[PDB]
Design a protein around this ligand. Structure first.
Ligand SMILES: *[C@@H]1O[C@H](CO)[C@@H](O[C@@H]2O[C@H](CO)[C@@H](O)[C@H](O)[C@H]2NC(C)=O)[C@H](O)[C@H]1NC(C)=O
Ligand SMILES: *[C@@H]1O[C@H](CO)[C@@H](O[C@@H]2O[C@H](CO)[C@@H](O)[C@H](O)[C@H]2NC(C)=O)[C@H](O)[C@H]1NC(C)=O
Ligand SMILES: *[C@@H]1O[C@H](CO)[C@@H](O[C@@H]2O[C@H](CO)[C@@H](O)[C@H](O)[C@H]2NC(C)=O)[C@H](O)[C@H]1NC(C)=O
Ligand SMILES: *[C@@H]1O[C@H](CO)[C@@H](O[C@@H]2O[C@H](CO)[C@@H](O)[C@H](O)[C@H]2NC(C)=O)[C@H](O)[C@H]1NC(C)=O
Ligand SMILES: *[C@@H]1O[C@H](CO)[C@@H](O[C@@H]2O[C@H](CO)[C@@H](O)[C@H](O)[C@H]2NC(C)=O)[C@H](O)[C@H]1NC(C)=O
Ligand code: ZN
Ligand code: ZN
Ligand code: ZN
Ligand code: ZN
Ligand code: ZN
Lengths: 346, 346, 346, 346, 346
């Protein structure tokens, strides 16, 4: 007997199957087990506060109206053009801004009905999901992107979602990201919605993302640090070399300015202060203060033996004080952002 | 009895229901109560003068042709594929440039009919809504984005929209924006359209948005201020140090130029003057004038005791005058844009 | 009697109405009166030579097959799902590169049939319309965007479009543009197409757009002018100060270069010369020539009393000649682009 | 008699017309005459190697099954909703990456059947067509964009395309391009495909595009040339002026660097060398070599009368040699790229 | 007899053909032979880790239910509107993020059925396929883009894909890429998926892409190398020329900074270190160290004959040591990235 005629009898008008009535309509809620396989993961954008995934979504439930014994085969397959003939959960992604199915060559959908009446429903789909990002502590930030699977119009006494016990979320191997590192550890949560209509089932997965630091260190932090060190070389230059020390001071300020202005195009465009901005501002205040130190020495020197000794003391004190206070700033900045502000992801 | 056959009888050919005829066709207008829940909020663009939202829109009205008593259950649910079998208000968003429904997994729509005949109709949808922005007073600007809910072809003697009394507009928690801060206080308004055809119902919500200032202060205002202070250090340098004072003056002008040119890529692209532009222009005029002050001192000095004293007086006067006039400018700029130009949002 | 059954009788099979046959099929052409209401206006792009509008388009004509007397009501409304049951003009936008209807909540369309048989057909739609831009005279340019309403397959002995006498094109209040100013005065034209098939009706509207100049003046023209003035301060510096005058000259050239290079990212990307480019090139030639003037003075001075006097004369002549020739250039540039090249918009 | 019933009889079930069977199914191939009218032309992108057009495409052929004599009128018009009732050629654009029809207001399609049976089929459509670009010789490059009209599944013994004799490709007046100039001369070609299945008809049009040079000359070539000339002014400065000549040399190198770095954002992003890159590299080697010339003079001078004379000879030789070798480079560069590399477009 | 009626009989209700039942339903798996012809290839993006292709995909299999002998012709053609009447493999692209068919003018699809029952099915389609990129070793990187052809719901005992023996993947001539060079050698692989459901057929093609280096060499590597050489010219300048050597040192550091900052906008935006970044960092450390060498010489010199000789020895040692250590760095960098890190593509 052909499997298509058996499906016509099983879900036909003589069977009285109604795709608008959930299984076990009188009694206990439908339990739906969910798996997710992530094929790709990227397009993490701060301007729109979202990211993009391409996933396989598998749902399994039981429909006792679909149990069959007559047919020899253990499973039946429904055509992806007639999926509207069967009841399916009204799952939706609660933080989704845009999404689409896939249809090139045949429909990228699959549905199997087993003898006991269990239904397996696997689809492939692309999502744009919202994630709020902080971006304070920016070079050394860690973000948490979530994915929520909610029911649209069924309360928790009608429909319940559950994560599969063995392996609910899997990620394909070899994936890479231009900016982040997707950690291996993933959170499976329960975020049941309490509204006025009632309790609505919602399960959730959290992914942890750590930004890489090698580019920011090698292109922004170390060049700024070398410019700051270069500003300290004014203190070892002869006191009477005004064109040398003044030109070195102001050119160091200009170099500091071009370094920050060129860095500005690569950084995320936000309106609040980030850790990198704190670093750039302090390095600018350091090269600004090294030029004010020479302005003080140059003015105190010309007042016409005591004045020359007093001017030379500001130089020898500045030779130790400026590196020391920059060391203390370094210690504080790195501990605050690598240890204090750094917190458990959970 | 199955709920789908009861819906077939209630809105069937034997019932004579007509989805093109509004409820209470002879008499009083249909009153529609609206709620909005904002899931996400962002993509605020000045180049297109618009922003993007993802919302739940709930409408409630009464249809006395849909009242039922026979059925045991208190509510009935209509399938989202047969929504064209029921009358619905012809709501539209009057400032919408682009919009779309959501359809991944099942249709993201819901409709419930109660025994009294009340209809609840909840849909989920994405909008791109226009908002004119001013962007004068730019770092310290405040914008007001609106959302208008109008009827398309019904006059106010046929269809009236009302905001729900308890909570018409709600925003989900945890939302963030790269540039703005969405205030908690929201305006519910009435913007009834008066045309030649008649009065058309239109209700409106206003959201208030305040730009954050920390980045603009730490990266644009303070570095410009330090460059201006650095231009004043020419006045404490010996009068006969022409290569030092001239090179410091012109390098300060170049640093000022690179600071503004690098800042130009991050700012909004508009053709009129913004407050930041006023600040950048005055700081450029200050470093330009400090170099002209040395050109005057250098020319007045060489005229061959009176000429040297006269040249030294321009220096000692400039040491107090330049910071003072920059202080007065600062006071005026900050009061005009933080107090005077700042106005009540209503 | 229900209005939908009357519409079924009026445009039914017993009526013999044919939506493929124009009204007055044997005789005079159909006259269609058009209104346009512009809801939004923006996205004016030079890289694609186009702009974007969101409009209401209203068309009115007479169909004597649709005249009714039996029905009590003065007007009837057709459902936007059955618009293919009535004849409509085959209007299209002749300079349209992309366009779409609007469908969120109900269809954004409307059609009313009056007793005399007059039809009113109002739709809402988004357009991307092409406009060729010149962009010579760029800071001070004025553009004219048009909108053409043509018939696709009807000649002028079958279909004629007319602008409404009272108010054919209206613009909503409060619209703003980041770059331009939409003038209040609008042109209503006739651009009848003459082809080999015959005369085709086409009506047209022109909108006038004037670029704002405040940003370009405050950020590009005035800073360039101050750099040019700063290059003239070399002439008041002592002749024997070679490191001062040479370093001021070359740093002025570098400042001029960074000013133009930073300006280059904000300007439109075209391959021909614009007025701003003429200004930048002349200011570069001025700071280049001020450094060549010192190279001539420095070379003429060292030739070992006549040579020192001759070198001092080039300086005192240059102190008047360089500002004068820059004044003449300013006068010519501003009159040519503000008066001569500026022409009547019509 | 109504024209729609005559079309129902002519292409009806009683007529036996089959829209899947080409005209003259037993014998000679169908000859299809093609016209193209180009409404707009732009969006020429090197990052995707493509351009965008909006065209009218007219096809004419003969179908002897559609010949009619009974009807009084000379032509009949088919409704654009029933175009699937008639045989049409399976034309496609062989280098098309993306394309779409136009549908706002009515369908932008037209089909006329004459008494002899000739069919005229005119449609309006947007194309994104691929064109490989070279971009070597970049400021002075010339590109050739093609458009190929192929059959998809008919061999040359069934379907043949021909260009119309009188005017096959026309361009609307007033079109402009931000970067190129579309030449008036166009090539009509035959690019018949030879495959394993057989010969497939394919006709082709080539458009010639010449880049404009005014911006590149006024903003990149002339400023670089002035910087090179400014580097030669070191040779007329006194030999003992080490801070002047060294600072002028290195600031000229820095100015050269900022000029190239600012130019880099406007140029096309490719991985191979372009003519502009050759020019920028040689100008950098010239300002680099002028500073090495002073390093040689400064070192040869201090060796403690012969050494001072020998050092002065390198200066006077460099005053003539550096402009001469830059003139020879200019002559060679301009002849190679304007004459030698420049080739006939055919 | 018309070919369409024969197709109606062959795949009709009297024939009992079922498009949901694969050929040879009881026994051996269906063998599908695949060809790919690549029409275009580009849009290789690192921000989304993907590339774009436009291809012809040909599949051939055997369906013994479709064998015919009565008809005179050797082949039959199915209409692209009735492709759902025939069984087709459920191929899909396993690394596809987005894809679409082509439909302008007729459907870009083709299907032929031969007498033996062999089916040939050729379609044209656009793909966006994911490829993970490394981008370490960035100027000199080599990437491998793959394309996987998998079955969606058939195991390897039902459906097997095979590459055609003669020529499975062909590329059209004349294709170019702005950044890469598509090598001629291509890998045909077998990447059979082993899941819990069973073995799923999957065939794969790898394309090899080598980045071109001419732009990076002429615009980034050589200018950086000339700046490094210019920093060595401080060692041949007189020891007592503090304003010359200090200003040359710091201006060389500033030039190095502007060169890197201008280069930053063209490079790919990633968070890890690339080979170019290593080169830029070492060149910055070289110009930084040349200025520290003068700070050491200037400090050791003024201590008041032994001190002047000791200071002159650091200069003469640095004249050989700095070029030598830069040569060793060059040798190591170029061998590590051109030879060691360079590996066989397989
Ligand atoms: C879905 O899962 C829930 C949770 O296990 C089931 O609810 C339980 O049903 C058993 C019936 O044997 C009762 O004894 C328990 O008290 C129920 N627990 C709760 C918390 O309600 C439910 O039966 C399942 N649904 C179906 C259709 O089997
Ligand atoms: C919609 O709301 C309006 C406003 O309350 C209702 O109009 C009122 O109807 C009552 C009937 O009891 C009259 O007494 C009032 O005078 C009406 N007020 C106005 C301003 O017209 C209207 O009846 C409501 N519609 C329906 C269907 O109940
Ligand atoms: C559409 O408008 C045209 C222009 O007014 C009408 O053409 C005129 O018709 C009147 C009939 O009373 C003639 O007397 C005029 O000579 C016509 N003028 C021209 C220029 O042809 C036309 O009748 C209108 N169409 C309809 C259906 O009323
Ligand atoms: C399409 O055009 C071709 C080329 O002119 C026609 O082929 C010719 O047909 C005539 C019939 O009078 C023969 O005498 C020629 O020898 C043919 N030439 C070739 C090269 O085959 C063809 O008949 C045309 N198709 C139709 C339907 O008229
Ligand atoms: C598809 O190809 C496979 C591989 O050649 C075929 O499987 C073979 O079938 C022959 C039948 O003559 C057997 O003798 C071999 O032992 C089979 N090999 C394997 C590895 O199974 C298969 O028959 C082909 N399918 C069809 C429909 O012909
Ligand atoms: Zn897809
Ligand atoms: Zn969606
Ligand atoms: Zn819309
Ligand atoms: Zn269109
Ligand atoms: Zn296409």
């Amino acid at each position: 007997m052909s499997p298509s005629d058996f499906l016509d009898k099983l879900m036909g008008r003589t069977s009285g199957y109604d795709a608008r009535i959930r299984p076990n309509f009188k009694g206990p809620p439908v339990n739906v087990t969910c798996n997710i396989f992530i094929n790709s993961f990227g397009s993490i954008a701060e301007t729109t506060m979202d990211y993009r995934v391409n996933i396989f979504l598998r749902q399994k439930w039981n429909d006792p109206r679909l149990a069959y014994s007559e047919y020899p085969d253990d499973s039946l397959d429904l055509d992806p053009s007639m999926l509207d003939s069967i009841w399916k959960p009204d799952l939706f992604f609660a933080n989704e801004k845009g999404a689409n199915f896939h249809e090139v060559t045949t429909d990228n959908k699959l549905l199997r009905i087993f003898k006991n009446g269990n239904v397996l429903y696997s689809i492939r789909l692309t999502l744009t999901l919202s994630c709020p990002m902080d971006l304070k502590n920016f070079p050394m930030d860690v973000q948490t992107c979530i994915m929520q699977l909610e029911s649209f119009g069924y309360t928790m006494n009608d429909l319940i979602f559950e994560w599969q016990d063995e392996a609910p979320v899997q990620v394909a191997e070899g994936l890479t990201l231009p900016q982040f590192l997707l950690k291996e550890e993933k959170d499976l949560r329960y975020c049941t919605k309490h509204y006025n209509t009632g309790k609505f089932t919602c399960i959730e997965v959290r992914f942890h993302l750590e930004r890489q630091m090698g580019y920011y260190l090698i292109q922004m932090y170390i060049p700024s640090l070398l410019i700051v060190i270069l500003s300290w070389v004014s203190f070892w230059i002869n006191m009477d070399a005004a064109p040398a020390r003044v030109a070195l001071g102001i050119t160091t300020v200009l170099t500091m300015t071009t370094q920050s202005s060129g860095s500005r195009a690569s950084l995320p465009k936000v309106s609040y202060v980030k850790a990198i901005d704190i670093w750039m501002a302090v390095c600018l205040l350091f090269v600004f203060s090294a030029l004010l130190e020479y302005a003080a020495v140059n003015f105190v020197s010309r007042q016409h033996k005591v004045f020359i000794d007093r001017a030379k003391k500001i130089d020898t004190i500045s030779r130790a004080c400026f590196p020391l206070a920059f060391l203390i700033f370094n210690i504080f900045y790195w501990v605050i952002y690598k240890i204090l502000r750094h917190e458990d992801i959970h």
